Amino acid sequence: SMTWNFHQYYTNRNDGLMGKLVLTDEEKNNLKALRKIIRLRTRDVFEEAKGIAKAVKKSALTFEIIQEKVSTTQIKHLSDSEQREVAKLIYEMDDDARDEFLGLTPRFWTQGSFQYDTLNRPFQPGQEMDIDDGTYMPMPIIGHSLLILLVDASLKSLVAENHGWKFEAKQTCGRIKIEAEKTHIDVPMYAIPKDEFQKKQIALEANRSYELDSENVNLALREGDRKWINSDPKIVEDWFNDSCIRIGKHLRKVCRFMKAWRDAQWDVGGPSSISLMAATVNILDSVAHDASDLGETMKIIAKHLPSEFARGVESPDSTDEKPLFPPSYKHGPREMDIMSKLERLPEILSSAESADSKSEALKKINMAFGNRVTNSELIVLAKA
Ligand SMILES: Nc1nc(=O)c2ncn([C@@H]3O[C@H](COP(=O)(O)O[C@H]4[C@@H](O)[C@H](n5cnc6c(N)ncnc65)O[C@@H]4COP(=O)(O)CP(=O)(O)OP(=O)(O)O)[C@@H](O)[C@H]3O)c2[nH]1
Numbered sequence: 351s352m353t354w355n356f357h358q359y360y361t362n363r364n365d366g367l368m369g370k371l372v373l374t375d376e377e378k379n380n381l382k383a384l385r386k387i388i389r390l391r392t393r394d395v396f397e398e399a400k401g402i403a404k405a406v407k408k409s410a411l412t413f414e415i416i417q418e419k420v421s422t423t424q425i426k427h428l429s430d431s432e433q434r435e436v437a438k439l440i441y442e443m444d445d446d447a448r449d450e451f452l453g454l455t456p457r458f459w460t461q462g463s464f465q466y467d468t469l470n471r472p473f474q475p476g477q478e479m480d481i482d483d484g485t486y487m488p489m490p491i492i493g494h495s496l497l498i499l500l501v502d503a504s505l506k507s508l509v510a511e512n513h514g515w516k517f518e519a520k521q522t523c524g525r526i527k528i529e530a531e532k533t534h535i536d537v538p539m540y541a542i543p544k545d546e547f548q549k550k551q552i553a554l555e556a557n558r559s560y561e562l563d564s565e566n567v568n569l570a571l572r573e574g575d576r577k578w579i580n581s582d583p584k585i586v587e588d589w590f591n592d593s594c595i596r597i598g599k600h601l602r603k604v605c606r607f608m609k610a611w612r613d614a615q616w617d618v619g620g621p622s623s624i625s626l627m628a629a630t631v632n633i634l635d636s637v638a639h640d641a642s643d644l645g646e647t648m649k650i651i652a653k654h655l656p657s658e659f660a661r662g663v664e665s666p667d668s669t670d671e672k673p674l675f676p677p678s679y680k681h682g683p684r685e686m687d688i689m690s691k692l693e694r695l696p697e698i699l700s701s702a703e704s705a706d707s708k709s710e711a712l713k714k715i716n717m718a719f720g721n722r723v724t725n726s727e728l729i730v731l732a733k734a
């Protein structure tokens with residue numbers, strides 16, 4: 351019958367899918383403002399704690415005195431038991447550890463889709479704009495417990511100052527959720543080598559008006575036997591940025607489209623954003639496609655994703671042994687459900703391509719991406 355071209359459906363920045371997914375400048379700035387609020391408080395809470403440690407160093411303080419001091423700082427927004435732990439930890443530092451703590455100032459680096467520009471406007475109720483802002487502690491080679499308590503104190507002190515904010519503890523981060531604004535901010539915490547951080551910060555400021563060795567970037571884990579895991583988020587940022595330069599400007603677009611497909615097919619759940627990115631990069635690295643037709647390119651991606659996910663999707667961090675998505679012999683109900691929807695996507699896109707009219711084509715492709723694009727005039731007859 352007829353054959354439709356969907357390039358403008360995907361890419362029109364006003365009415366097309368990109369126009370629906372990309373945050374406005376006002377919205378990006380609001381997330382930047384939120385990140386800055388978290389950073390300022392975290393630096394302030396660390397200074398208050400260091401102020402207490404400095405008093406302990408300057409003169410012998412009893413545990414009860416340290417407890418009272420803790421209780422007058424913004425650490426007061428922790429629970430009473432947690433405040434005791436913070437006081438105990440500060441009191442029990444030996445002279446050497448205390449000197450290291452007095453020298454600590456947290457540093458920050460954003461990771462995830464806010465950093466490499468693939469953050470989509472959320473679609474279904476419950477979905478939220480996500481800022482992943484890592485907090486970094488330069489140390490040699492100071493306790494895991496203390497560092498987690500102080501970041502928790504910072505986040506809880508902000509929650510105590512804002513109606514509708516909620517703190518959530520997760521295995522790999524602290525989170526502040528702002529449900530009414532469809533926004534949350536995740537704060538993973540890292541330990542990094544102090545000597546190397548300093549040396550490279552100096553070098554960086556000298557070249558202006560290097561990167562930390564990935565092996566020593568340690569992500570704090572909240573529960574279990576392992577308190578730390580080596581996981582440098584910049585590995586993913588660098589791998590994705592290089593992939594964009596290598597594959598082209600359309601990579602960021604089709605990764606957004608696959609994430610939006612995911613958001614439309616599951617209110618919560620579905621394949622991780624990073625697993626979609628990795629599979630998509632693999633396909634586009636190994637299959638001929640045409641960037642001037644993202645409708646065609648999306649068809650090619652959809653055809654190949656099931657097999658990518660079936661063989662298992664490995665992390666761009668080769669030091670990470672966990673797959674982003676397990677191979678099919680390891681699939682349980684959750685993975686089988688993801689395979690099912692992945693297998694459906696090509697069928698949906700095919701149905702759209704051979705619809706009898708523009709409005710029918712729009713309806714069919716919106717089975718994949720939701721009723722977000724409404725302008726059927728973005729869909730046009732394919733050229734002879
Ligand atoms: N360095 C690092 N290593 C870890 O192993 C890791 N796992 C989680 N985190 C960060 O913790 C915060 C909470 O994460 P989630 O509970 O939401 O789950 C993560 C992980 O399942 C997975 N993921 C993230 N980073 C890695 C990854 N380096 N290697 C393997 N898997 C990883 O993906 C989930 C989503 O994380 P992001 O929000 O960062 C990915 P995105 O591009 O921003 O996607 P979007 O939000 O737009 O949907 C959070 O801050 C994590 O980044 C990690 N950070």
Ligand SMILES: [Mg+2]
Pocket residue numbers: 462463464480481482
């Ligand atoms: Mg994220």
Ligand SMILES: [Mg+2]
Pocket residue numbers: 462480481482535536
């Ligand atoms: Mg997050």
